[PDB]
Amino acid sequence: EDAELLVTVRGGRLRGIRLKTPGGPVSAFLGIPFAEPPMGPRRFLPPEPKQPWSGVVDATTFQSVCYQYVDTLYPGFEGTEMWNPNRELSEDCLYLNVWTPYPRPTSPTPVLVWIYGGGFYSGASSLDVYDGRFLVQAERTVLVSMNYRVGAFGFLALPGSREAPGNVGLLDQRLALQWVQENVAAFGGDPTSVTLFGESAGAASVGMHLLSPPSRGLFHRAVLQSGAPNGPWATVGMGEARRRATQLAHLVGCPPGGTGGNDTELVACLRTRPAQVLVNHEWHVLPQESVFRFSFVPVVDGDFLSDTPEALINAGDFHGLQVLVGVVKDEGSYFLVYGAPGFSKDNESLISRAEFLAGVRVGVPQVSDLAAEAVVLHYTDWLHPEDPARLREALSDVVGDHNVVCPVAQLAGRLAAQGARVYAYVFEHRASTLSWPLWMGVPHGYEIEFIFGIPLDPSRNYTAEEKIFAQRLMRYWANFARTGDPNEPRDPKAPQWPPYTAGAQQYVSLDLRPLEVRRGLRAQACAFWNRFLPKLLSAT
Amino acid sequence: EDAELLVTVRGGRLRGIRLKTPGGPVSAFLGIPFAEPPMGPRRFLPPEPKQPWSGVVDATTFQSVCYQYVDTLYPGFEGTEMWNPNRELSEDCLYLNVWTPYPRPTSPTPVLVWIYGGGFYSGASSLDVYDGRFLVQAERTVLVSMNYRVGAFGFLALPGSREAPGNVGLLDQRLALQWVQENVAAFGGDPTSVTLFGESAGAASVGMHLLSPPSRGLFHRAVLQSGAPNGPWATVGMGEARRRATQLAHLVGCPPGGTGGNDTELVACLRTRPAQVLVNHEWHVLPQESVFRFSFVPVVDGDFLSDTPEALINAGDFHGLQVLVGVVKDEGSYFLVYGAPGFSKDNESLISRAEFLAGVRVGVPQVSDLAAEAVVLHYTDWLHPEDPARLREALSDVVGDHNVVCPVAQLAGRLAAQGARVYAYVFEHRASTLSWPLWMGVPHGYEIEFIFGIPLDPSRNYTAEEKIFAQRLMRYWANFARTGDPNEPRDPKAPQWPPYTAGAQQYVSLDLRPLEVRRGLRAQACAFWNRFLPKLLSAT
Numbered sequence A, B: 001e002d003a004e005l006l007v008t009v010r011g012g013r014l015r016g017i018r019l020k021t022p023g024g025p026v027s028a029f030l031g032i033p034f035a036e037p038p039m040g041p042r043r044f045l046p047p048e049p050k051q052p053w054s055g056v057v058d059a060t061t062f063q064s065v066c067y068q069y070v071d072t073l074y075p076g077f078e079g080t081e082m083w084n085p086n087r088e089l090s091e092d093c094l095y096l097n098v099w100t101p102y103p104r105p106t107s108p109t110p111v112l113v114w115i116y117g118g119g120f121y122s123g124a125s126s127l128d129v130y131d132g133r134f135l136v137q138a139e140r141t142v143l144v145s146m147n148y149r150v151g152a153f154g155f156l157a158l159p160g161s162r163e164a165p166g167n168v169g170l171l172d173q174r175l176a177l178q179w180v181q182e183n184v185a186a187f188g189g190d191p192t193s194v195t196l197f198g199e200s201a202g203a204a205s206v207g208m209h210l211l212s213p214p215s216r217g218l219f220h221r222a223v224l225q226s227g228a229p230n231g232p233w234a235t236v237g238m239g240e241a242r243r244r245a246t247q248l249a250h251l252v253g254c255p256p257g258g259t260g261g262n263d264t265e266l267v268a269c270l271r272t273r274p275a276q277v278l279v280n281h282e283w284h285v286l287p288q289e290s291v292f293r294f295s296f297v298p299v300v301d302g303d304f305l306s307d308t309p310e311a312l313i314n315a316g317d318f319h320g321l322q323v324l325v326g327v328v329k330d331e332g333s334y335f336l337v338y339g340a341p342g343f344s345k346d347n348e349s350l351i352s353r354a355e356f357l358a359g360v361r362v363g364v365p366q367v368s369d370l371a372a373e374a375v376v377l378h379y380t381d382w383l384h385p386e387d388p389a390r391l392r393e394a395l396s397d398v399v400g401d402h403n404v405v406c407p408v409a410q411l412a413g414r415l416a417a418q419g420a421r422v423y424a425y426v427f428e429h430r431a432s433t434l435s436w437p438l439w440m441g442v443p444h445g446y447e448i449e450f451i452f453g454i455p456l457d458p459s460r461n462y463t464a465e466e467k468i469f470a471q472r473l474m475r476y477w478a479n480f481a482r483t484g485d486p487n488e489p490r491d492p493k494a495p496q497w498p499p500y501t502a503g504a505q506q507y508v509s510l511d512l513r514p515l516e517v518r519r520g521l522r523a524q525a526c527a528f529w530n531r532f533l534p535k536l537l538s539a540t
């Protein structure tokens, strides 16, 4: 018996599986329960730690995906199906995975913890693009990844109530962080060197753990890829969260007329519905037509978040913290085919001026007409106010800057100014195997496959340069996880990655070429969103 | 005796004078009266034509400069005193000048009519920089220039009342245009080919005549240099004009204590005051501290202008009209030493961030703080928001765009779209003899000396290339006067000057290097001034 694949934790024993890589094996422990199944009366409730078990839990395959909406916009299309659940759906989904090098480290080893994105309504740790075998083999860190409840099961909130407090999906992540503290040593991992990293809604989750004291003591570095907690999509107010929860209850027959509708009876009725019935109405509760807006997201209750993320970032002391942040080149192009008029993944999407003006109200919903006019002023090329190709890039910039690029830059500058050491990047390589149309450029989410070393998979058709490029990125991420600085420790030959400051605002472009330093994360555009537009909305 | 210096016109006989140029003599008739002296009871009234005289009026020297404020900011300085009056001040100032080639043309010759600027409060046709001997000698055109009343004597208005109708200085200009119609043939000039050209407030004046039906039938082409009638400084409302005229009257003791307030006594009391007393209180009636704002300007009365210039430009059909418009590279730098904090012509004017924010309220007076916030957003480089040099040029752009470059580009686009053939230029040569500091670049008003061929004066220190350059511009301006087209018209190797259209927005740069087409007269900045900022003021 290979004792490598046999490990004991505080709950009991596990058997793992050995994974092959072109350069050696890794030990994987997939599907470890870290919480009691949040079913029945535990729906919408904070997680309870998994009770200890007799025997040996089989940890050889990924467990079930949490109940979530399944994208059907393009059936059979790799670009969308690669994010859909690849396991059976179940509310019994609170399991985590641990990768560790072979042979198991006799040293303590820094631990990377992955939090998947998906707009807080979708995502799973079992997706092939989150496969940690290549990262662990190449850089010999310990990689953990958890499943957390999404959609209504994770973020439905009747604020101020005990039956559905909200943010329980964030607590699921926190519970897996505490599990890493108490058990990662048994896998050769150093619980004093824990680096969180996530993408999209995962990056917002990482940022919200930076701003939550109870979670703050469970990690020491943080990486936020194409996401931030301060953005306009990542949180929601109590009153609007209550309206959406009530809207979902009404759509599924809760409460049954004409019985009372206080918070206890409302959640009690919600707990009797099959989980799929709730999923089938999740998008019906969004107030207006939009892109980059989701129904059940973290709520600002005063509990998990003392105040708004924006407030906590401003009043926050971040000394002793090192953060890696960044975005992709075209953060907004992916979302345009999900509601922007005139857009289609199967043509050039050379939109008209009327479609551009119509899309601005969908990409920037919930704003006054004067605010929309300011957006149109800032993003119109007035020497070419109706060139379709430029209108397409402009709306992509509108959605991208408003939702990702500027909230990130807002966070990056406020962190470096208030004590934190910050590194910033912009991912500019478009995968040679990318299936989305070329007018999308480098879309949201398509740096992940290079961070996780997927090109090293011999069954895939990446090029030789992309494999070398994937090794550079895993080195950057591992160097940062080990030292807090992505630069190679004793290497002066390598082009160096300067920190990001509030004044210089230096970042690097990541692609096949060597590192290239630039300054300003779209400084002129983000000044409009971060500085002027709030003044335009308050003076109304 | 040379008989070509003796010419008879409708009012009587004249003796002129012969002026020398390096390439041949020119016949000049300086000081022809075209109106009765607007003195005594005729102060503030429209001009009356000059009654016929017996004998020979001497026309060998310039007549008196109209009463006006005299700049004292920098005594002894060539940069300011080149614009100050060079003849005695008098209300008896309605005289015009005619230059004509030697020998006098035998066939009708195109006429250029100059209208000096000076914020409607200053200026004279006798200034050395307006000497027409070189333009008339080099291009054998006929040049006329007139004096018109400035300040209160030309533009004090009690709207509605008959004793201070307002715009009498524009009627002075109109009367000089009727004189050119009735008499320029006696000098060899073609009254069917007359081209107006003015600078600053003269360019605005030229625009007002384009929009005035009684004046429109007196010319066929227009050149507007660094000015337009639609700008924020060239016109004033009726209610504001009444308040400025009433405050001036109070500042000089009108009316006497306890006597009535009706408009006849007000003007009657104003007519008893010495002209210098009215001049000494001119800058005291303005509302706020500001640059590029003047007390007595054309009033929108319903008479000379049936509506505002901005409205008349939109509604008018300009088919059959050719327009030459343009600007200098640094339109706003001159005005900063006249009120912007931290500025001085004798240092580098490296202002601070606080001084930039203060200067914006002086450069854009009486706008909302929200409007000023948008101004600062647009002209701050947020990667270098406090570099003193960038703040200096940014404030120069603020004053230049708001007052000159964007009203001109707006007029140029509307003229071309609505039937007129338009040519646009940017003057980018800084005179080698310029006495203003180097940080001012190419200031307001310093293309005039090259248009008028001043470098050809042997008693100056211009370089050889500047003389060649001045001949190119005189050829440009003269070709446009003859043909309505600044091109040769045939070389065709000479680099051509394409018309300005509302779409392509093509203009050329005028300097020592050959002509060069560019696109967009500050397209992005003028979209903020022309398109966005109005909607911001409407929402308040």
Ligand SMILES: C=CC[N+](C)(C)c1ccc(CCC(=O)CCc2ccc([N+](C)(C)CC=C)cc2)cc1
Pocket: A073, A083, A117, A118, A119, A123, A199, A200, A201, A283, A291, A292, A293, A334, A335, A338, A339, A444, A445
């Ligand atoms: C690609 C990124 C990968 N990761 C990071 C996981 C990722 C990040 C972010 C997202 C959200 C994408 C959307 O905002 C579509 C939202 C949307 C979906 C469906 C609908 N219907 C209306 C139901 C369909 C009709 C059109 C409307 C809106 C997905 C995946």
Ligand SMILES: C=CC[N+](C)(C)c1ccc(CCC(=O)CCc2ccc([N+](C)(C)CC=C)cc2)cc1
Pocket: B073, B083, B117, B118, B119, B123, B199, B200, B201, B283, B291, B292, B293, B334, B335, B338, B339, B444, B445
């Ligand atoms: C240079 C161009 C030549 N031309 C075209 C004739 C020309 C065009 C435009 C102007 C206006 C210049 C000003 O706006 C000074 C305005 C000003 C003057 C005096 C004052 N005090 C308060 C009295 C002095 C204190 C500062 C304030 C403001 C001048 C000349």
